[PDB]
Write a protein that binds this ligand. Structure first.
Ligand SMILES: CCCCCCCC/C=C\CCCCCCCC(=O)O
Ligand SMILES: CCCCCCCC/C=C\CCCCCCCC(=O)O
Ligand SMILES: CCCCCCCC/C=C\CCCCCCCC(=O)O
Lengths: 528, 528, 528
């Protein structure tokens, strides 16, 4: 190694941070508190313990627990040693978890006690794993016992910045989960690009060195949006809640004085509706809602409590952060409604992101605010391919750009608004129509609980619209009324307003995926 | 090139910035104003004009003018084409300028009209340069004429991120100027590391997207501390003053509402003493004084006008930025005096900087706040060596660290305070004493104008102190009185307070370098 | 390519065979007959059809049907083009079939009509396959239609002999099926090594150029033991039965005068028990029983009909053929019983096979006829590793030898007799005992239908024996009687004859794998 040749490694985020206070605190909710000095000591102890277990440079260590100090220590100790960190989506079915464990070829597994029953259905079909480390919360944690017998001194190696650091296996539509991976250089660049793009905001949505961080994202998904790295680089106080409960998170916010966090719309809705929330001070909090498509009504309800709500976009192949809503001081003067419409957009692209919209032939459509197409991006922190995949990898990076899979339009100003998914487009004859805009119109009815819209083939206009609706409790309206409910609107293309092809049907129960996302593929299977 | 393999290039700072407003302004003081859209068009036009002139990838283009929009366009167009940008220190002697021109082997030269007389002494000894482009301010600029006949469309090439981008030839003690160079990757990393480290400040010293930038640094020195790149990445309004005049800078500050700038202590003293400054509002301005050793009295005088003054450290081999003073909100409550003492320090190291202090054997002395040693650093933006140099390059990177040449001590908190230079240490017997702390003590006298302290060899205690002083107008005190003036103090090592070895001498005139820095090498030559 | 440098390719088996008669016949049972000239023409036509479909050198084509002329044409046309041939085990569960299809990344799929329902559960989760070719038997086959429109001329390419030719995904104990692959060189060497080792037999078990071949092995398992290649190299008449039915195979044997075949003990038992078999002439037939552990009583019953029965050993990682029973003329004089005992052995190793037996430390135990150990082999036709596997691949080739997984002893003469599996050994205290020898002893009882023996942990003697038995119809004997039934025998180690640790249990139904092999892993799960 040439000392004059600098490698961008994860250890430089921890030992060469923006700020470091040895008496700043790390809090595991109502369980444990220590300082940054103790946190560094524990990272070195964990490196020693891993080295004793026989974890070499190329090895893979799989982690399975909640949000805690242990996960934060794994986010650092494992990559610095040179090993790979495999975050396991504990919400997948045990068959898919077994598939990802086999595909990644883990050597050690750190599994929380509460997830032991899952392992009891899978353990007989695992070959690569040689050690199971059972994580507990009170006193009998094997992780704590392993730490306790190791020294707080360790000389972290210097290797190439292109060595892989993390993998986490997103599940999309392929049939088997696809493994995405990142390197030390990519994570370091992601932390500094996002800190530079949104830490430099004028006044509204900025993360600074006086914030108190607390994740409300599962932290095995996408590195928790890269936020633990950014928060530890800034040397801010961090609070970890463990298992998400709406009324324990509210207590943590009130008592630890959390100012910055991030979640998905469902958790935000659960928090704002909780009985204790009504008697709480929220006007210091800056939640980031980047899970999926922040609704405007939820944004309006969160704005009336004086919460800095804004949306972001990421994809789990992309770092994930690609775009963030940032409001100019001219826009910070509008009323709630216009602000709600601005804050719920996909947002403008962050530093070092290209973000074009193309058609099926990669033609780079104009940014006029109306024309829709699929977003293709280039960024310093994208996965080159899928792990152990060839054809899907080629379909991902087709034409020299990473294909996101979302259909959106971009304003002249730069604001992006995702309209639909590429696979959910209705190919009626010779035009493309979003199926998302139809679902919410049916959702506006007083006797519908959930709407899923798919497309059935039809000889002359190709695949046409078809709506599957589940009615509410003690509500019974025939499909004829529902057909006329949507016909009341105007301003649609093709035949008048697209009326005679709806063919709405009433469904007792709608198939959902393991996580809870509506499964529009098997819906096509059982309806076709 | 692999599209999935991202290269960190300068064109990504311009076309993938943090923010971009096409109607944001670039102002050349009282001469010209255009917008960011026009600025991008002019960058493409300049790329076209350079391509027509025959500037290939490896070529070098030398620039010689003041701070203007033209220099900002050269900071971008030349590196993107692939060529090298050579900034010429217009304050060196024409012999040294000729040496640097010959050493760099420039092909084109862009020289301002006012610097033409300098060229008239040098032009007969230049072989490599084939074109001279004369820059003017009113209407007959050849740069403007070259731009006017070129199209605003250009496809900038994609090359390796390790291609050299800039060189500027620092002059130290070697005898000939030494050429330092940086690459695209290093400049991109410098812009994002500094933006992340000081844009994320809580409240005090932060550069954000609502600032108005105006350099007061020569902009050929060290890339103007990297600040034009950071300011154009943030998409802020920029004001360029041209030739520094104290009362034109004040008018620019008042009228364009500048909030962020950077200079050296002499310019700040000249501004604060100007008659028009007294009737001006300064409480929105955040000058950064990182030239050399911000005095505490100047800091105190600037703090009473409510100016956010803070210091930084750089070296012209180092990017340059290495450390910045950043105050915690606990420290933003002290009175002026304690704040003056905090703001005039060298400061804490920025993100991704290592910054140890070692002895002559590279032993990494402790950080106790008292022990002094030479600072050695590792950072992503340091020159690997000197251009076309071998032995000096080896002396620079000795022991795997870049040697700065400054002697400082570091607190436990992290604050650095530079005490002296390595070459100016007095090697009295077996201990090292700073010669800087003695000079200011003599400066406190009422009849001394300037003090320079060097060291004469002496058999038993080695090199010993020796002070050369120039008296004021109509002041005549013999060296005996001056010897007793310093003896009044206490708390020094060695023989009592170091009294019998001063041997102060009175000098009519003190030799100064070309820029204006006291020349302690020839002072030794004429006194030894 | 150097013409003087010979590459061992599969096309040389077809175009440079031992013998070639253009009027020799290929028979698809009661469906089709053509000659070897037509067969060569059809191979060239299929090469043309595959080239039109866009199958390049690296592509994979997956085949799913019965034993037919189409499978024989796929055994040649696909490898010669350079593509990979993926044989799909149609007897696995559709989940495992989907896993193997995804893992192999097939481009085309040739699937028989009868296997279409299986595809109906899997098709929605397949991404790589772009064409489905439906095979039928009467007139509407898409394979026949694709052939009919292509020319019978094709120039087969010359490539490296180390290019992969076939893959078929064995399923063992890992939890997911493991993919094994072979090259052109390995298949050519396998065909010539086996032809040289058993074609040169003195009189008994020899395949010569006057035989009539007919497979009774699924032909997707292990290349049908490499026998179609050997039979087409010799240019003999070949009969393909399609779907195995006991009374259609007997008709084929009687009418086409088949002399050489190969099956597994179950099919041989089904044939010898069929009502039509009793009135048939069998004294020209040379079935090879190499499926799993030819029983001695079945061998004795097949010997009384004057059938040349002998056993072979293979493993699906090994070519497969490793050993064959070959009788010297001295041994061809013993009565049925001694001949039955000789013919049911694993046999002596074939040409170019090493075949040691080692212990757990790879110590190469002696060949005394009593000492047992695991067989480790070296041969020219073994898979280097598992496809896309690292740790299992290392466990397979541990110590420089391929580990078979079987425990056997070898006589001084050279005869091998497999006693058990490595994973099924009972680790009673400090000795290893085969669990297979116990099962047949219990099977000798008049009121037991099937016995499975596993091992339960026990503190002082480690894992101990445990027998699970299912009783016959209208038979009810308690476990106490069964315990005494086995105690009647003698000559066993450890405690007397291993009596007090049996702990036999009665089970209503025993878990079986997908193919029909007893699942001793889940039996441990539900009993432990
Ligand atoms: C101050 C900067 C810190 C905040 C950065 C913004 C947080 C990122 C929010 C938007 C990106 C959304 C990422 C999640 C999408 C992937 C889906 C998932 O893994 O759950
Ligand atoms: C918001 C960040 C922008 C401000 C960054 C701080 C500016 C840098 C000031 C301290 C570094 C001093 C660099 C000059 C030292 C080299 C000497 C020279 O070339 O003149
Ligand atoms: C004249 C030589 C032709 C006969 C060669 C002998 C045939 C091979 C018989 C013994 C090998 C058994 C191979 C099957 C074991 C693998 C299991 C399977 O795939 O079904």
């Amino acid at each position: 190694n040439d000392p004059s040749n600098y490698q961008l490694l994860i250890k430089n985020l921890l030992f060469s941070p923006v700020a470091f206070n040895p008496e700043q605190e790390i809090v595991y909710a109502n369980h444990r508190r220590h300082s940054y000095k103790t946190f560094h000591d524990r990272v070195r102890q964990f490196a020693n313990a891993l080295t004793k277990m026989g974890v070499k440079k190329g090895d893979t260590v799989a982690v399975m627990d909640y949000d805690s100090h242990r996960y934060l220590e794994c986010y650092f100790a494992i990559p610095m040693i040179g090993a790979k960190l495999h975050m396991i989506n504990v919400r997948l079915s045990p068959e898919q978890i077994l598939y990802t464990i086999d595909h990644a070829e883990d050597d050690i597994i750190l599994i929380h006690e509460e997830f032991l029953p899952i392992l009891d259905q899978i353990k007989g079909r695992i070959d690569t794993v040689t050690r199971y480390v059972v994580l507990r919360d009170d006193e009998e944690c094997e992780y704590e016992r392993l730490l306790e017998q190791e020294s707080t001194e360790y000389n972290f190696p210097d290797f190439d910045e292109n060595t892989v650091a993390t993998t986490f296996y997103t599940t999309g539509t392929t049939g088997f989960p696809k493994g995405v991976f990142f390197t030390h250089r990519q994570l370091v660049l992601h932390t500094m690009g996002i800190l530079s793009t949104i830490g430099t905001n004028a006044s509204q949505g900025r993360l600074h060195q006086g914030d108190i961080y607390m994740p409300i994202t599962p932290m095995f998904h996408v590195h928790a949006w890269g936020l633990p790295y950014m928060a530890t680089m800034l040397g801010v106080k961090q609070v970890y809640p463990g298992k998400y409960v709406p009324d324990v998170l509210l207590n943590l916010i009130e008592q630890e004085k959390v100012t910055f966090s991030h979640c998905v719309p469902t958790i935000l809705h659960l928090l704002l509706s909780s009985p204790k929330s009504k008697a709480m001070d929220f006007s210091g909090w800056k939640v980031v809602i980047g899970g999926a498509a922040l609704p405007k009504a939820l944004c309006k309800s969160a704005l009336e409590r004086d919460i800095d709500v804004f949306a972001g976009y990421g994809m789990s192949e992309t770092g994930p952060i690609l775009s963030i809503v940032q409001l100019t001081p001219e826009q910070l003067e509008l009323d709630v409604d216009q602000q709600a419409e601005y804050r719920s957009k996909t947002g403008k692209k962050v530093a070092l992101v290209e973000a074009y919209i193309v058609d099926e032939d990669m033609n780079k459509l104009p940014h006029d605010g109306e024309t829709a197409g699929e977003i293709v991006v280039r960024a310093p922190w994208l996965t080159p391919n899928y792990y152990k995949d060839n054809k899907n990898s080629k379909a991902l990076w087709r034409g020299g750009y990473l294909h996101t899979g979302d259909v959106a339009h971009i304003d002249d100003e730069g604001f992006i608004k995702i309209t639909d998914r590429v696979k959910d487009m209705i190919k009626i004859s010779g035009e493309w129509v979003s199926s998302l805009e139809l679902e919410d119109i049916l959702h506006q009815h007083q006797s519908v609980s959930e709407v899923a819209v798919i497309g059935m083939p039809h000889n002359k206009w190709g695949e046409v619209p078809l709506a599957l609706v589940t009615l509410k409790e003690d509500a019974q309206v025939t499909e004829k009324e529902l057909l006329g409910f949507a016909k009341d609107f105007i301003n649609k293309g093709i035949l008048a307003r697209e009326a005679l092809l709806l063919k709405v049907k009433i469904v007792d129960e709608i198939a959902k995926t393991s996580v809870g996302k509506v499964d529009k593929k098997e819906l096509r299977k059982l309806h076709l």
